[PDB]
Amino acid sequence: RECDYCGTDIEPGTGTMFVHKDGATTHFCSSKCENNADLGREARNLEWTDTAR
């Protein structure tokens, strides 16, 4: 699987899956991504992210 935030490959047997109010599902590779998402930051704008580069 791939991270629905940064875009890197989520190491199997790792990660968290957040379920939204409407039903939408968002997989995360780490807490770093989760916390960056909670700050309202979009992955496109951050340079360390695989989506950007």
Binding site: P12, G13, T14, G15, T16, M17, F18, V19, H20, K21, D22, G23, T25
Partner: protein, 132 residues
């Protein structure tokens, strides 16, 4: 009961104010007890995903309010561990009111449900919109 097929870290306690994921007329539920649970000294009785709890209606329609009904914990904020090691967390803590035969009191279920609840309470699953 039947195995959930996941490891649950209980996110609710006796007295917790949770959401009523149905069209019964009940808006906010308050946990009173948990079915088949027996704790230890000083420990607040814990409830979580897949547990059949006993609840009182805090908010809602004048007719549904103050009633002592049974429910099933559909969603919870604290992560649960699935067989593949992946953790799953929800937006809110939610429950659906149930009757004596483990069938939903209402007709339509609001919001998503966990696939683990499907194995224990079937008629709640076959009434669910989204199953994650």
């Amino acid at each position: 009961m039947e195995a959930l097929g996941a490891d649950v870290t209980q996110g609710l306690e006796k007295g917790s104010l949770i959401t009523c994921a149905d069209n019964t007329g009940a808006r906010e539920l308050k946990v009173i007890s948990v079915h088949g649970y027996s704790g230890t000294k000083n420990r607040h009785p814990k409830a979580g995903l897949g547990d059949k709890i006993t609840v009182s209606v805090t908010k809602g329609t004048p007719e549904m309010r103050r009633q002592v009904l049974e429910a099933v914990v559909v969603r919870q904020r604290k992560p649960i561990r699935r067989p593949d090691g992946t953790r799953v967390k929800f937006e809110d803590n939610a429950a659906v009111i149930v009757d004596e035969n483990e069938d939903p009191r209402g007709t339509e279920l609001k919001g998503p449900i966990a696939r683990e609840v499907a194995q224990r309470f079937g008629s709640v699953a076959s009434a669910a919109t989204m199953i994650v």
